[PDB]
Design a protein around this ligand. Structure first.
Ligand SMILES: [Mg+2]
Ligand SMILES: [Mg+2]
Ligand SMILES: [Mg+2]
Ligand SMILES: [Mg+2]
Ligand SMILES: [Mg+2]
Ligand SMILES: [Mg+2]
Ligand SMILES: [Mg+2]
Ligand SMILES: [Mg+2]
Ligand SMILES: [Mg+2]
Ligand SMILES: [Mg+2]
Ligand SMILES: [Mg+2]
Ligand SMILES: [Mg+2]
Ligand SMILES: [Mg+2]
Ligand SMILES: [Mg+2]
Ligand SMILES: [Mg+2]
Ligand SMILES: [Mg+2]
Ligand SMILES: [Mg+2]
Ligand SMILES: [Mg+2]
Ligand SMILES: [Mg+2]
Ligand SMILES: [Mg+2]
Ligand SMILES: [Mg+2]
Ligand SMILES: [Mg+2]
Ligand SMILES: [Mg+2]
Ligand SMILES: [Mg+2]
Ligand SMILES: [Mg+2]
Ligand SMILES: [Mg+2]
Ligand SMILES: [Mg+2]
Ligand SMILES: [Mg+2]
Ligand SMILES: [Mg+2]
Ligand SMILES: [Mg+2]
Ligand SMILES: [Mg+2]
Ligand SMILES: [Mg+2]
Ligand SMILES: [Mg+2]
Ligand SMILES: [Mg+2]
Ligand SMILES: [Mg+2]
Ligand SMILES: [Mg+2]
Ligand SMILES: [Mg+2]
Ligand SMILES: [Mg+2]
Ligand SMILES: [Mg+2]
Ligand SMILES: [Mg+2]
Ligand SMILES: [Mg+2]
Ligand SMILES: [Mg+2]
Ligand SMILES: [Mg+2]
Ligand SMILES: [Mg+2]
Ligand SMILES: [Mg+2]
Ligand SMILES: [Mg+2]
Ligand SMILES: [Mg+2]
Ligand SMILES: [Mg+2]
Ligand SMILES: [Mg+2]
Ligand SMILES: [Mg+2]
Ligand SMILES: [Mg+2]
Ligand SMILES: [Mg+2]
Ligand SMILES: [Mg+2]
Ligand SMILES: [Mg+2]
Ligand SMILES: [Mg+2]
Ligand SMILES: [Mg+2]
Ligand SMILES: [Mg+2]
Ligand SMILES: [Mg+2]
Ligand SMILES: [Mg+2]
Ligand SMILES: [Mg+2]
Ligand SMILES: [Mg+2]
Ligand SMILES: [Mg+2]
Ligand SMILES: [Mg+2]
Ligand SMILES: [Mg+2]
Ligand SMILES: [Mg+2]
Ligand SMILES: [Mg+2]
Ligand SMILES: [Mg+2]
Ligand SMILES: [Mg+2]
Ligand SMILES: [Mg+2]
Ligand SMILES: [Mg+2]
Ligand SMILES: [Mg+2]
Ligand SMILES: [Mg+2]
Ligand SMILES: [Mg+2]
Ligand SMILES: [Mg+2]
Ligand SMILES: [Mg+2]
Ligand SMILES: [Mg+2]
Ligand SMILES: [Mg+2]
Ligand SMILES: [Mg+2]
Ligand SMILES: [Mg+2]
Ligand SMILES: [Mg+2]
Ligand SMILES: [Mg+2]
Ligand SMILES: [Mg+2]
Ligand SMILES: [Mg+2]
Ligand SMILES: [Mg+2]
Ligand SMILES: [Mg+2]
Ligand SMILES: [Mg+2]
Ligand SMILES: [Mg+2]
Lengths: 96, 200
RNA sequence: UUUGGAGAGUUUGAUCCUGGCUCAGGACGAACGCUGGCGGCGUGCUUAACACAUGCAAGUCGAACGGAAAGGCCCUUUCGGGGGUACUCGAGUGGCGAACGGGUGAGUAACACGUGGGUGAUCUGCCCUGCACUUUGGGAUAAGCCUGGGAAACUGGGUCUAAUACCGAAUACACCCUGCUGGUCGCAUGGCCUGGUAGGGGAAAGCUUUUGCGGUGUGGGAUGGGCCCGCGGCCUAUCAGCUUGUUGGUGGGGUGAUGGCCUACCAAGGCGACGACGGGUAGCCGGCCUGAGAGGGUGACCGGCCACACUGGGACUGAGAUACGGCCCAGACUCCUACGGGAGGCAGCAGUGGGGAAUAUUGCACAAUGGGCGCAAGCCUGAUGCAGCGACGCCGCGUGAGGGAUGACGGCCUUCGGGUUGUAAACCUCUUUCAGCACAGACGAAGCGCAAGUGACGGUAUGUGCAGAAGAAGGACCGGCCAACUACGUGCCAGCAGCCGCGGUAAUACGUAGGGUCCGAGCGUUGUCCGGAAUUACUGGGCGUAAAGAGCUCGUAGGUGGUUUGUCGCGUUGUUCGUGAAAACUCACAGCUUAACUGUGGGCGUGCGGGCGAUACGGGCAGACUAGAGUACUGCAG
């Protein structure tokens, strides 16, 4: 069961997270199949980016995201587009 | 960390004025010490280091800082000397000095460190700030009310404003437009010696 | 069509060459010596893979069962307690996790690693999704009760209980096997078209009444694996033969899959001078440093694999084992004992002893994110976020100023005229960063809950006020290489030193003073690596004398070929689609006030895979001639 992981990189006082589709049982920073987005909350707005096409393809083929990934891609609007209940909404706030 | 010792030592020992208004240098051009008149053998390395130390003790930069400017200037594709001259002049201290708002590099640096300046409406207190093309420099009311700033801004009759720098009004707004060329910059000394010394 | 290469001193009376050494540069997981202020961001046992005091690092389900030891309620009460309740639950069955996450580099020269495909030869729980069913019978055990051994761990004997614990039987007709009959593909058995055909065989368990999950099988996808190979990458003949399941075939067993993986029977060879077998060292790679490049050195951190868990072995379980905190046995060490016997494996996070030059705190949380369980709520997670220590490193900031004399003390020299420290200083004014004292005070969370809230960090980061230049600088060098000199004190003594080299009474080289130079919260010493070293010379060296032509021939293996007369294109370039994980380097953009830091999208990602298009050189192959060579005829001198 491949899951959407967030791979830790970098150094200590700033955590790193990479939205990568891979097998679940592997290491937290384990083998990466494809890199689709990156996550880092230390910055003030904590901007989030996901490749919509690849995310939709992975959800269709059967990658199961963790609840935080689901929530974040709902903020992005990928979940909204995939389920089709509200539509495709864009509300993300851009850097000043 | 900044050199707290006398500033006239650099000019006296080294043999060319730096501030430009040194009466001691013109009174006695020879280096201080009991034996400043002794004849000294010519050396390419003496003169190469001489140009370096003139530059660094004139602009007040750090050694690691200046070496970082050197490697930066090398890695831009443009000409190394012009790139180094821009990357050194882009220091906000030198910019605000040559704009006429400061009497000397040291005083510009001290005022910037204390933070009397605003950059595009954003608080800035860093003497080594980087100014890119088409930037805006602002001066706050707490500093317009400051007495030495008023003295500088109504005594600014120093060297003429350059091409890339220009003031627009009493608020002392400093604007930058383009990259100057060496010919109109007409800065003293010669970057070839410094670039060759670090090429060693 | 664009980017980037420095030398100097030192042999001689003197120079030129060759040749050696040393120095100026960058970097470290560094250390010692003096000094020392804060804040942010990294880093942290390289030796002893040595033994380890104590506590933590792996748990969850009453909506599975029997039950109620400890909490709640309700009837009771003599306050000893007696009944139901399932809210809740100790312990017991039964599942799920436990092979996840973290650690170290001893062995390993190997398909162990990277790249490149692969599987007509495999399997795969938990996820999603198109498509049948889920009928029935039986018995027992833990738990509990009684009892024994025994300090203890732990065990036996008797009685007894339920289940999603256990086992039959009913279907399956779409699968799994064996015998008979077609089309496609080639890459060969044979695969595919679920080929057709006759016979044989094959599984389930229910719960909840709610955003519903389960059981057995494989036409389709994806992940995960296992296996085989072209190619690559240390030194050493003062290591020349190695091997006997060894090599090959056939028949059997074996494993998920083919296979000397194992056995039997047949034959004698395979590997070997285009370095086998031996000996020493060592985890490999993207990367790091140096160098213009080639190249050399190296494997810090991170990340992709590899191998191990005190030493050596072995096996069960499972879709998945070198099974680290699983099992069994043998060793060494430690510990408890009531002497009858038992318990262990910090190379998990911290910490202690020893080695060392030395490397941290027995700190706070699931707030964010990954991981496990569960319908969810929720639980756990030294993974992780954070804080504390240490100038060890890439990076930013602070110890102030403007003016002030032909230049006030005092020191050091003097030629006794004076010159030095010096705009330095005392002075008159300024803003007072950061520490100090107060107030406000975040984001990090369109996140989770049908609840009313949820931030360890932190009451920090960050803004707003208060007082005062008030709290803040040292280290090396000063003979030439190499920017920086005079005096004072002992003279072949005491001593310096990277090369030359410096003191035998008047040292710019020793020690002290001043003075100046370099660097700076770091300054030098020490050790390792590259460059200069074209000093291992492919680019890019020589062999007359400095180091070198073996004593010289014949000649095997290899390396290299005198003209033009002919295909296939195996040395090769001819263009295109097709890989180059992530990360790093280089270019531009953008954000943290700029600083490290990181936020987004490119670009980069210098090698290797297949389909399509070329034939001038550089090879084999498919035919002819002769300028090298040889023979043939006549002479020749020795
Ligand atoms: Mg792991
Ligand atoms: Mg936001
Ligand atoms: Mg959650
Ligand atoms: Mg250089
Ligand atoms: Mg360049
Ligand atoms: Mg010599
Ligand atoms: Mg000689
Ligand atoms: Mg000599
Ligand atoms: Mg700090
Ligand atoms: Mg730290
Ligand atoms: Mg313990
Ligand atoms: Mg459970
Ligand atoms: Mg219970
Ligand atoms: Mg399991
Ligand atoms: Mg396990
Ligand atoms: Mg495990
Ligand atoms: Mg480690
Ligand atoms: Mg270790
Ligand atoms: Mg090893
Ligand atoms: Mg080997
Ligand atoms: Mg499974
Ligand atoms: Mg049944
Ligand atoms: Mg029983
Ligand atoms: Mg019954
Ligand atoms: Mg049956
Ligand atoms: Mg049947
Ligand atoms: Mg039948
Ligand atoms: Mg059919
Ligand atoms: Mg059953
Ligand atoms: Mg279940
Ligand atoms: Mg292969
Ligand atoms: Mg290879
Ligand atoms: Mg066989
Ligand atoms: Mg066979
Ligand atoms: Mg075999
Ligand atoms: Mg056999
Ligand atoms: Mg490489
Ligand atoms: Mg090079
Ligand atoms: Mg080289
Ligand atoms: Mg290596
Ligand atoms: Mg990794
Ligand atoms: Mg692999
Ligand atoms: Mg072992
Ligand atoms: Mg072992
Ligand atoms: Mg084992
Ligand atoms: Mg363990
Ligand atoms: Mg353990
Ligand atoms: Mg152990
Ligand atoms: Mg640990
Ligand atoms: Mg020790
Ligand atoms: Mg340390
Ligand atoms: Mg979590
Ligand atoms: Mg809910
Ligand atoms: Mg717990
Ligand atoms: Mg807990
Ligand atoms: Mg931390
Ligand atoms: Mg220290
Ligand atoms: Mg200290
Ligand atoms: Mg700093
Ligand atoms: Mg002043
Ligand atoms: Mg403040
Ligand atoms: Mg908030
Ligand atoms: Mg909000
Ligand atoms: Mg601030
Ligand atoms: Mg000198
Ligand atoms: Mg000098
Ligand atoms: Mg003397
Ligand atoms: Mg000095
Ligand atoms: Mg070197
Ligand atoms: Mg050549
Ligand atoms: Mg050579
Ligand atoms: Mg010779
Ligand atoms: Mg010879
Ligand atoms: Mg000989
Ligand atoms: Mg031949
Ligand atoms: Mg070809
Ligand atoms: Mg092609
Ligand atoms: Mg290609
Ligand atoms: Mg990428
Ligand atoms: Mg570079
Ligand atoms: Mg910005
Ligand atoms: Mg990039
Ligand atoms: Mg390269
Ligand atoms: Mg040939
Ligand atoms: Mg002929
Ligand atoms: Mg002939
Ligand atoms: Mg004759």
């Amino acid at each position: 069961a491949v899951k959407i992981k967030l791979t830790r990189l970098g150094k200590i006082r700033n955590p790193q997270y990479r939205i990568i589709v891979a097998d679940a049982r592997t290491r937290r920073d384990g083998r990466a199949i494809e890199v689709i987005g990156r996550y880092h909350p230390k910055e003030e707005p904590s901007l989030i980016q996901i490749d919509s096409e690849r995310a939709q393809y992975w959800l269709g083929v059967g990658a199961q995201p963790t609840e935080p990934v689901l929530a974040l891609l709902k903020i992005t609007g990928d979940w909204q587009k995939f389920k089709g209940l509200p539509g495709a909404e864009g509300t993300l706030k851009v850097k000043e | 960390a900044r050199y707290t010792g006398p500033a006239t030592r650099k000019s006296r020992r080294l043999g060319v004025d730096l501030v430009g208004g040194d009466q001691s240098f013109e009174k006695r051009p020879y280096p201080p010490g009991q034996h400043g008149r002794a004849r000294i053998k010519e050396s390419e390395y003496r003169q190469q280091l001489q140009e370096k130390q003139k530059a660094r003790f004139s602009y007040g930069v750090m050694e690691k800082q200046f070496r970082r400017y050197y490697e930066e200037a090398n890695r831009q594709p443009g000409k190394t000397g012009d790139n180094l001259l821009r990357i050194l002049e882009s220091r906000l201290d030198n910019v605000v000095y040559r704009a006429g708002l400061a009497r000397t590099r040291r005083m510009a640096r001290q005022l910037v460190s204390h933070g009397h300046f605003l950059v595009n409406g954003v608080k800035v207190d860093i003497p080594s700030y980087r100014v890119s093309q088409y930037d805006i420099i602002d001066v706050k009311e707490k500093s317009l009310n400051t007495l030495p700033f008023q003295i500088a801004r109504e005594t600014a009759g120093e060297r003429p404003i350059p091409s890339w720098l220009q003031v627009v009004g009493e608020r002392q707004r400093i604007l930058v437009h383009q990259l100057p060329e060496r010919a109109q910059i007409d800065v003293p000394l010669t970057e070839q010696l410094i670039v060759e010394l670090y090429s060693k």
